[PDB]
Amino acid sequence: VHEFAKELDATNISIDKVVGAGEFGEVCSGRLKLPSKKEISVAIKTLKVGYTEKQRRDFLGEASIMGQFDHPNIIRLEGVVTKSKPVMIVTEYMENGSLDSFLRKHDAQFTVIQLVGMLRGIASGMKYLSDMGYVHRDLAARNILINSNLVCKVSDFGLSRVLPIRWTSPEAIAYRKFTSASDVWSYGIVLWEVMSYGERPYWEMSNQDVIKAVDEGYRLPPPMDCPAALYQLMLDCWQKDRNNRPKFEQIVSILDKLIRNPGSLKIITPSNLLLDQS
Ligand SMILES: Cc1ccc(-c2c(C)sc(NC(=O)CCCC(=O)O)c2C(N)=O)cc1C
């Protein structure tokens, strides 16, 4: 873990608040005093008391991965604490939490340009992540964190691997073909989640029907008041042929253009899912 993660001194960490419960323990907020004496807000994951050796390797595995990425749109690892207890993972603090829960609180309250900014950040992080040879495999709004200034960052590298049905590409479902192109599929789902202000992909459809419908060519319908440009980008991301999906670099390019000319977004778009003939 120490190849990519600094060991932090626990005396430099203050825990101010328990903010939630994670797979391996509590999630807290607090402060970290840096070697320069500067103090920053951080989030802290603790490893639960009584952990097995396996839980420890799995827990810290997320830090080893996170530690490899230094990018404004990937959650920043400040370090770990292993030489004292409890065992900790320390990251930058993301005040507005997971993106899907944040958007659910603010239905229809942001501008299209604001949403596109969010979407651009996610794509830029994923562009870097794919550049680095990593397939995330669990790209979803719930795994995106958003900070006080609405900057969105890819997080949760639990299932991430060196090269969740609703977010997974058909080919990855069919025979575990995970590529960066299957992450792009997932991105298309995230894009739908954002424009839907945190509605659940495919709502509560049975898993078997999600698989079958998507395979038959059905796609999530356009979110309310969704710009045609953004809905078509979802469709491009959801191409049956993974070869035909845009690369993350192209997605970033597309979103940089939509940001540049807000006039672009003014065009607005027999079953609940739509049959995309393409
Ligand atoms: C390694 C890692 C990964 C993600 C986080 C993290 C969560 C799982 S949740 C949250 N931030 C919030 O929930 C904001 C709550 C706001 C409030 O309580 O007022 C974070 C995070 N990075 O801030 C944490 C770690 C350590």
* Buried residues in 52-85 as b, exposed as e (16+ CB within 10 A): eeebeeebbebbbbbbbbebebbbbbbbbbbeee
Domain boundary among 45, 73, 94: 94
Q: How was this structure determined?
A: X-ray
Cβ-Cβ contacts under 8 Å for 60 (sequence gap 6 or more): 1, 5, 80, 82, 87, 89
Judge if the upstream peptide bond of residue 221 is cis by omega within 30 degrees of 0.
no
Cα torsion 48, 20, 198, 170 to 10°: value is: 0
User: Do 107 and 162 share a domain, yes or no?
Assistant: yes
Query: Which two structure tokens, joined as six digits, stand for 203?
Result: 């709502």
Distance separating alpha carbons of residues 192 and 5, to the nearest angstrom = 34
Distance separating alpha carbons of residues 65 and 69, to the nearest angstrom = 7
User: Do 207 and 134 share a domain, yes or no?
Assistant: yes
Q: Is 156 tagged catalytic?
A: no
* H-helix or E-strand spanning residue 275: strand 274-275
Cβ-Cβ contacts under 8 Å for 88 (sequence gap 6 or more): 8, 10, 13, 44, 45, 46, 47, 80, 81
Burial class (CB in 10 A: 0-12, 13-18, 19+), 49: exposed
Residues β-bridged to residue 154: 74, 144
Ligand 1, pocket-test mutation among 24, 87, 94, 156, most atoms within 8 A of CB = 94
Distance separating alpha carbons of residues 97 and 198, to the nearest angstrom = 13
Domain at 141, CATH number: 1.10.510.10
Query: What are the DSSP E strand ranges found in 139-264?
Result: 144-146, 152-154, 161-162, 218-219
Cα torsion 136, 189, 77, 105 to 10°: value is: -160
State the Rg of the chain over Cα. 19
Q: Which residue positions form the known binding site?
A: 20-25, 45, 92-98, 142-143
User: Do 144 and 278 share a domain, yes or no?
Assistant: yes
Which residue's entry shows tokens 């990018």? 71
Protein residue with its CA nearest to atom 12 in ligand 1: 97
User: Do 48 and 104 share a domain, yes or no?
Assistant: no
Distance separating alpha carbons of residues 91 and 234, to the nearest angstrom = 31
User: Do 57 and 71 share a domain, yes or no?
Assistant: yes
Closest to 140 (Cα-Cα) out of 126, 161, 124: 126
Distance of CA 219 to the CA centre of its chain: 21
Q: Which residue positions form the known binding site for ATP?
A: 20-25, 45, 92-98, 142-143
Closest to 278 (Cα-Cα) out of 247, 250, 246, 236: 236
Protein residue with its CA nearest to atom 5 in ligand 1: 43
Distance of CA 128 to the CA centre of its chain: 13
User: Do 87 and 101 share a domain, yes or no?
Assistant: no
Burial class (CB in 10 A: 0-12, 13-18, 19+), 38: exposed
User: Do 62 and 173 share a domain, yes or no?
Assistant: no
Resolution of the structure in the document, Å: 2.0
The answer to whether residues 79 and 6 touch, using CB atoms and an 8 Å cutoff, is yes
Tell me the C-alpha to C-alpha distance, in Å, between residue 141 and each of 30, 38, 260. 24, 32, 24
The answer to whether residues 242 and 172 touch, using CB atoms and an 8 Å cutoff, is no
Query: What are the DSSP E strand ranges found in 87-160?
Result: 88-92, 134-135, 144-146, 152-154
User: Do 117 and 28 share a domain, yes or no?
Assistant: no
Query: Which two structure tokens, joined as six digits, stand for 51?
Result: 């952990």
Cβ-Cβ contacts under 8 Å for 191 (sequence gap 6 or more): 119, 230, 233, 234, 237
User: Do 116 and 2 share a domain, yes or no?
Assistant: no
Domain at 56, CATH number: 3.30.200.20
- DSSP-based three-state secondary structure for 57: helix
Q: Which structural domain range is residue 82 located in?
A: 1-94
Distance separating alpha carbons of residues 21 and 30, to the nearest angstrom = 15
DSSP 14: E
Domain boundary among 94, 117, 145: 94
Cβ-Cβ contacts under 8 Å for 30 (sequence gap 6 or more): 13, 14, 15, 16, 17, 41, 42, 43, 44
Which residue's entry shows tokens 């120490």? 2
45 lines ligand 1 (CB under 6 A): yes
User: Do 189 and 247 share a domain, yes or no?
Assistant: yes
Domain boundary among 40, 63, 94: 94
User: Do 12 and 101 share a domain, yes or no?
Assistant: no
Which residue's entry shows tokens 């595995």? 61
> How many distinct structural domains can be found in the chain?
2
DSSP string, 246-269: PPHHHHHHHHHHHHH-TTGGG-B-
User: Do 16 and 89 share a domain, yes or no?
Assistant: yes
- Catalytic residue, from 70, 100, 131, 138: name it: 138
